[PDB]
Amino acid sequence: GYVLGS
Amino acid sequence: GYVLGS
Amino acid sequence: GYVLGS
Amino acid sequence: GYVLGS
Amino acid sequence: GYVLGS
Amino acid sequence: GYVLGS
Amino acid sequence: GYVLGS
Amino acid sequence: GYVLGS
Amino acid sequence: GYVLGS
Amino acid sequence: GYVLGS
Amino acid sequence: GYVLGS
Amino acid sequence: GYVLGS
User: Fold this and answer.
1) Which residues neighbour D2 within 8 Å (Cβ) at sequence distance 6 or greater?
2) Closest-CA residue in chain F for H2?
3) Side-chain half-sphere exposure of K2, counting CA atoms within 13 A
4) Residue C4 near residue E2, CB atoms below 8 Å
5) Which residue of C lies nearest to B5 if distances are taken between CA atoms?
6) Which residues have C-beta within 8 Å of that of residue K6, sequence separation ≥ 6?
7) CB contact (8 A) between residue E2 and residue D4
8) DSSP line for C1-6
9) Alpha-carbon distance K1 to H5, whole Å?
10) Contact between residue B3 and residue C2 where contact means Cβ atoms under 8 Å apart
11) Chains near J (3 or more Cβ pairs under 8 Å)
12) Which chains touch G (3 or more CB pairs under 8 A)?
């Protein structure tokens, strides 16, 4: 998985 | 906006 | 909060 | 792997 | 806080 | 923004 | 390896 | 896993 | 604090 | 920002 | 090796 | 593992 805050 | 990927 | 399983 | 965020 | 499983 | 990768 | 952040 | 604060 | 498993 | 890698 | 930071 | 403070 991944996450980009903005 | 934020981006979530799984 | 958030959760990505994979 | 899984990802948890709070 | 956060957690990355791998 | 921050970036998380697993 | 896993990653924990607080 | 990895983390970029900004 | 933080922890890197590997 | 800081960078963590495992 | 593992890395702990406080 | 590695850590870059900034």
Assistant:
1) A1, C3, C4, C5, C6, E3, E4, E5, F6
2) F5
3) 8
4) no
5) C4
6) I1
7) yes
8) -EEE--
9) 22
10) no
11) G, H, I, L
12) E, H, I, J
